[model samples]
Target: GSTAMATTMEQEICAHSMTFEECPKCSALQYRNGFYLLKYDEEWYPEELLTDGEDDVFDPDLDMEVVFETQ
Candidate 1:
């Protein structure tokens, strides 16, 4: 007989050198929305996603490393 089990994982990082810069369009705070790696139909795609700041934008340069895995 065989059975399935549940698993969980978590991680944390520090971004001390992170800096926020003014956006080109709106002179407001900018922040890095985030990034994503997706798999569809046995295909992989990497997208440097950006956050749309309607009123303001905060772009911060962060220094860190992120690792993730799954089965």
Candidate 2:
């Protein structure tokens, strides 16, 4: 039997640049209405996934770095 499985819209990164379903950060805004309303599937209803605005985009490489200074 399928208990059913689902994913958080913004938990994982869909693309190397953008986040999954809702990448409101950088690549998130890449697809607006032009995205043709790609809604989520069953077992749960989804909220508005896309909107229009100018948040600006970036490469996210130089400005993105992960470092932990253990003390």
Candidate 3:
């Protein structure tokens, strides 16, 4: 998006054949249930990657990290 090296996580499909939200492993880290709750450290799957938007999903862009910093 804003950066060249980093683009929208939405377009990125998990190599494991799983949806970006349900993805378990992306080669680097482990995400249990990425749909609504994912690893706070993951930045690959952005909100755009999500198929549904009815509920609040985790955003690695700063939402989770900001709170993760405190806890």
**Residue range 1-71, candidate 2, lDDT tens digits:** 12322354554545444444445554445533323234344211122341311222134422123233211
lDDT of 3 at 28: 25
In model 2, residue pairs whose N, Cα or C atoms come closer than 3 Å (at least 3 residues apart or on different chains), thus clashing, are: 23-28
Q: Which regions of candidate 1 fall more than 4 Å away from where they truly are?
A: 1-17, 22-32, 39-71
Candidate 3 C-alpha lDDT tens digits along 12-47? 556555445534454324533435445467663544
Give the count of colliding residue pairs in each prediction: 7, 1, 0
Q: Assess candidate 1 and give its TM-score to the true structure.
A: 0.13
> Model 2: how far is 26 from its true place, Å?
2.0
Estimate TM-scores for all models.
0.13, 0.19, 0.20
Q: What is the lDDT of residue 56 in candidate 2?
A: 24
Ranking by TM-score: 3, 2, 1
- Taken over the whole model, the C-alpha lDDT of each candidate is 0.25, 0.36, 0.45
- Which candidate leads in lDDT? 3
Candidate ranking (lDDT, best to worst): 3, 2, 1
Winner by TM-score: 3
The stretch of ten residues in a row with the least summed lDDT in candidate 1 is 4-13
User: Candidate 2 at 34: error in angstroms?
Assistant: 18
